[PDB]
Design a protein around this ligand. Structure first.
Ligand SMILES: Nc1ncnc2c1ncn2[C@@H]1O[C@H](CSCC[C@H](N)C(=O)O)[C@@H](O)[C@H]1O
Ligand SMILES: [Ca+2]
Length: 212
């Protein structure tokens, strides 16, 4: 019984089906009071909400779905006929996200593509995609910079395409910021957001020397 399964149960048991806001408050409630989980949260969500409303996207790409919180967060604001694509490399997470979208009533607005961003991004042409209006980067931080260039070289970015990258300060995406902040092709803006708690997997490598 994974933690992602438990979050889904709590939603299925507490949220008003077909009410995305109710879904979000159920996830925020459970992930603030029972088990912390790596969803953007409501505070960041309110930034995301304003970016979507102020930039009025029609085609959105998400890198990193996890349980679907940020997909529900964005999908619920999109206009009729607007699409959200979300790329997720973990199949267990993708399934959880799919149920989350179904319960929220947003499955018609979203298309989950299972796989790694670096392998799927070059495929988007074969998904009836020309260019993107908005891109939310919240997957592996090691991938913000190469995916951005990949999106450029693939001809997926248009003049005015919005990029929104999470966790640029904590734990940090300093090469990505240095690239877009320093490039003439990107006009950047930073949105501070307080964070009460965040846990990320790290590790230590022991290496015993055995001789030349
Ligand atoms: N290269 C890659 N391609 C697609 N997904 C990736 C990826 N590297 C990491 N991920 C996924 O990105 C997720 C980051 S957590 C994302 C949280 C979610 N976007 C939200 O805020 O609601 C993880 O579930 C991980 O499986
Ligand atoms: Ca995040």
């Amino acid at each position: 019984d994974t933690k992602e399964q438990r979050i889904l149960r709590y939603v299925q048991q507490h949220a008003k089906p077909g009410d995305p806001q109710s879904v979000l408050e159920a996830i925020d409630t459970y992930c603030t009071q029972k088990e912390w989980a790596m969803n953007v949260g409501d505070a960041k969500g309110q930034i995301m909400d304003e970016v979507i409303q102020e930039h009025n996207p029609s085609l959105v790409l998400e890198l990193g779905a996890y349980c679907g919180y940020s997909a529900v967060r964005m999908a619920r604001l999109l206009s009729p006929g607007a699409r959200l694509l979300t790329m997720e490399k973990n199949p267990d997470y993708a399934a959880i996200t799919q149920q989350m979208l179904n319960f929220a009533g947003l499955q018609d607005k979203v298309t989950i593509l299972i796989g790694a961003s670096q392998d799927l991004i070059p495929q988007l042409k074969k998904y009836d995609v020309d260019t993107l209006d908005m891109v939310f980067l919240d997957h592996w931080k090691d991938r913000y910079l190469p995916d951005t260039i990949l999106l450029e070289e693939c001809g997926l970015l248009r003049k005015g395409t919005v990029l929104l990258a999470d966790n640029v300060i904590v734990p940090g995406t300093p090469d990505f910021l240095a690239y877009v902040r320093g490039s003439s092709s990107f006009e950047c803006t930073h949105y501070s957001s307080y964070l009460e708690y965040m846990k990320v997997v790290d590790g230590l490598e022991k290496a015993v020397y055995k001789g030349p």
